[PDB]
Design a binder for this molecule. Structure first.
Ligand SMILES: Nc1ncnc2c1ncn2[C@@H]1O[C@H](COCC#Cc2nc3c(N)ncnc3n2[C@@H]2O[C@H](CNS34(O)(O)CN3C4)[C@@H](O)[C@H]2O)[C@@H](O)[C@H]1O
Ligand SMILES: Nc1ncnc2c1ncn2[C@@H]1O[C@H](COCC#Cc2nc3c(N)ncnc3n2[C@@H]2O[C@H](CNS34(O)(O)CN3C4)[C@@H](O)[C@H]2O)[C@@H](O)[C@H]1O
Ligand SMILES: Nc1ncnc2c1ncn2[C@@H]1O[C@H](COCC#Cc2nc3c(N)ncnc3n2[C@@H]2O[C@H](CNS34(O)(O)CN3C4)[C@@H](O)[C@H]2O)[C@@H](O)[C@H]1O
Ligand SMILES: Nc1ncnc2c1ncn2[C@@H]1O[C@H](COCC#Cc2nc3c(N)ncnc3n2[C@@H]2O[C@H](CNS34(O)(O)CN3C4)[C@@H](O)[C@H]2O)[C@@H](O)[C@H]1O
Lengths: 261, 261, 261, 261
């Protein structure tokens, strides 16, 4: 079965990668980083995010696995010590796959670009004050004034979304969540304040009021977009697929990362 | 078609009720408060909540409609001025129904009681410190120390849940949301802090650590339960059905209640 | 020098107390629990709070010391292992005293009671909805609707106040801080949301709107007051005095209790 | 008496300025924008902030007055309609002055710059992750990871500080308040979370961990500083002085701006 392995690139991760490749050499496994069916990420969540984006055009054909040699490792299911066990289990395969929802971002300009996010997409201004009209299914909902906004996938809810006061949501829920960054609320300016959770097929559109340049982030990447007419958020029809070899429930994953381990 | 009408019981609501009954008298409509098919609530959200609980054994057979003569009226779809229009539309009927999810609470004792909630169920102690173990699908998630906990339905997310920092969630999502009330967090005591959103079939169990007496609220009602072994939360298989005669989207409803109207 | 020792009353705390008394027996120290000059509390912060309230009529004549045999021990400056060192240092004395500000609560009835708080005073309703008008120096500031309110001293800011989202304030600042418990905010009801910090000589008055019965807590104690006309908060002219034998800065105390130790 | 007038520069503000100058022409008043004793700002709070910074070297010799022709106008004490009344009152003078505290920011480099703030000073990274060690009076308090930090004066507490969850503090308190922007908190990273309120003479030092370039804002102005060794916050010994002609208490000012007016 075709596979590839990304590494965070420190000594520990590179050696683990070389050892797994050698172990894979003893099975019917072909290393192919053009059309892998299995993508193994060795590092932290940042390494995993880069792996996802390296293959976002073949998400339907790929199952991902994370090994944590980083610090927190939320998308990670394996410690390095279980690597040979994972080689052996991946060989002979017949594992189960689980799918998490993704967020689609569309950026339209004056005179379209689309992005897929595993954690979140955020919008801030390019220096000046950030002011957008928030339009939900063509209904004008609020005029947001503040630092910015964050639209999170379910598995992203434990990331930036959490730091912004968002809810943690189980990834079996096909939804996206919008959180505020430092909104202004006085006699003159009013936002909802609360995080908002949207189902599939709801469309959230941000429309500039004055300045039309924004800093748009998708996961680890942040780009200055100029002459923006609209930013559009919706739950993607695409999903990321994980190879799972044992039970590691999301809420236990949350417990292990935030409560104690 | 069998119907009944509850009133908040002030002069304005009673007269509106008498006028609608008289208007219904001109159609094939039978006033029946034992087995109504249509339940009209005239008042505020508290009146609507009481109407729901008055008929929680026949939720499958009933479509609800709220008229607001109260203050905020979140479950309300009609102003009093549209009552005769509603009489006429309900007559000839063939409206569409929409369903919102409900929360099931199970309270087990030493030596079972179940409740259905349209807004939320909360737990506090009976005086002493509130300490429970939070168990999610049999996995020990956290030991909660604080004032109490709140488990909200989707349509309840705009109520107590919102004041506790919870997310607002569209009611097409079959989920429940757990929020903390004033948790303690120091070197010794740790909670997740964040609201948690659970899908159908997930079970959240609260288990006492020391004191076993709790004040349990379901919507407007609050009961002291003694000798509690477990409180169990799950998304109910039952749903509340609304009669809808025009589009009034949830997010517009949220806008009208919190942003401006 | 006259002294007394309170104990949490578990085996560890009682024995430590008996050993310190025996050690004090070797100096010019007289055990007197009617008019002590030194009050030693052996336990946790709850034990310390009870010690403070046991002698709140002689705060001017007393210096307090806390020894932690409890769990967190925020008012504690000594581990049990340093008890004999403390006996010896207290003997020969000439320590320095530090003073923390206190909160005065006045409860007036239809047809006056005053309380002193080291941590905080809170107000909730006696069952029904909690609604009070908040009056600051005779200026009507807001109508608060919600679960309740909390007025904290500086040293209390790390306690209930912290769980309610309040700021942590250094106790050299003569101030009190008001935090909200789960306020309602919609089109119809509005509160400031933010914690408020008041200086000396500012008076914050809570005035009932409908129900006049409230559950008023002062530190560990909670009393049902009936027929309340007004609850009045002000920074007390009285201060609690600590005996300090070494530097243990407040911000280090905060670090040790919340960050790591 | 020497005076000058700044304008927001829209038609309404320029004409009001020309009319006040003409009215001042009828008294013993000399227009002098080099060494004014009175500085009148006509606009919003942004105009007032620019006026303050235009004369921050002569704060001891100047009393400020704000007239609001902008939107919210928190530092404003006059509506345009009261301008001639203000001309007349300023003439004959003998008003009272009130002083608000200020924040001093010191930025030290490898191989010193100081700033004065009326609202706040904030720090963010120059692109990469923001990580600083927070040192309070030479005691290492926490390692902050997140979007940034905000240090607010008392009168600044109603501004950015409020949006970040900070407490509102009366400006008679000589203090500064530190709030977090989106801190990370998991098993590995821990911050205090809560706003911190510091008295005079306490020094809060931010020390870089990896990246040494930061975006530092003081009130309306934001500068990229490179090769930073330390950012130092302390309550300034300098104060801003306001000319007050009538009672407009801070808490009423807060009420008028956030509750209703
Ligand atoms: N202010 C902020 N607060 C909180 N998160 C923020 C903030 N700004 C940006 N992010 C996040 O960064 C991500 C990019 O980096 C890779 C990742 C991830 C990551 N995913 C998750 C996840 N699903 N659940 C739990 N933890 C996660 N992580 C953990 O997030 C930490 C982030 N490293 S970080 O340096 O803290 C400021 N960070 C650059 C690590 O622990 C990592 O394990 C973006 O997708 C934002 O979600
Ligand atoms: N601290 C709290 N903060 C916020 N809500 C709280 C708190 N405590 C209890 N509740 C709530 O009360 C309900 C019982 O009363 C009837 C209802 C309702 C109600 N449903 C909703 C809803 N789905 N969406 C928006 N607003 C709603 N309302 C509005 O809630 C106000 C409540 N009246 S109230 O007096 O405020 C303290 N209240 C007794 C009214 O405006 C009403 O229209 C419980 O089911 C709790 O959800
Ligand atoms: N929801 C709440 N969240 C947070 N605190 C709450 C809440 N409700 C009430 N309180 C508090 O309880 C106090 C009475 O008890 C004694 C004390 C104290 C105490 N003082 C402090 C302090 N200055 N700084 C840091 N920690 C403190 N402590 C620590 O507070 C814990 C409290 N034990 S507790 O059981 O948690 C719900 N608690 C009864 C212990 O760790 C103790 O060391 C009241 O004066 C409220 O301030
Ligand atoms: N995310 C944020 N949330 C909240 N405030 C933020 C945020 N970012 C920056 N600031 C603030 O901006 C200031 C610079 O501008 C001038 C000012 C002021 C200003 N002072 C105050 C004050 N003492 N009390 C109450 N309101 C104030 N104002 C009101 O602040 C609004 C700000 N205009 S704004 O565009 O909102 C994002 N703003 C550029 C206006 O209403 C104004 O009247 C900085 O000193 C930050 O304090």
């Amino acid at each position: 079965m075709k596979y590839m392995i990304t590494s965070k690139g420190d000594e520990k991760s590179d050696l683990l990668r070389l050892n797994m490749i050698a172990g894979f050499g003893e099975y019917d496994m072909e290393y192919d980083d053009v059309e892998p069916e299995i993508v193994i990420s060795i590092g932290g969540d940042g390494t995993f995010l880069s792996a996802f984006h390296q293959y976002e055009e073949r998400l339907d054909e790929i199952a991902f696995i994370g090994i944590h040699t980083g610090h927190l490792g939320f998308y990670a299911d394996w410690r390095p010590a279980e690597a040979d066990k994972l080689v052996k289990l991946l060989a002979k395969g017949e594992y189960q796959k689980v799918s998490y929802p993704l967020l689609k971002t569309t950026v339209k300009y004056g005179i379209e670009a689309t992005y897929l996010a595993l954690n979140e997409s955020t919008v801030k201004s390019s220096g000046g004050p950030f002011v957008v009209d928030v339009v939900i299914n063509d209904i004008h909902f609020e005029r947001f004034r503040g630092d910015g906004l964050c639209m999170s996938t379910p598995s992203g809810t434990t990331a930036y979304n959490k730091s912004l006061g968002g809810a943690l949501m189980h990834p079996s829920i096909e939804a996206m969540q919008l959180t505020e960054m430092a909104s202004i609320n006085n006699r003159v300016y009013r936002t909802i304040g609360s995080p908002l959770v949207f189902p599939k097929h709801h469309v959230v559109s941000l429309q500039p009021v004055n300045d039309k340049d924004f800093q748009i982030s998708v996961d680890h990447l942040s780009i200055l977009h100029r002459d923006v007419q609209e930013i559009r958020y919706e739950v993607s029809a695409k999903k990321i697929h994980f190879a799972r070899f044992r039970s590691f429930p999301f809420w236990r994953r949350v417990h292990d990362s935030f409560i104690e381990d």
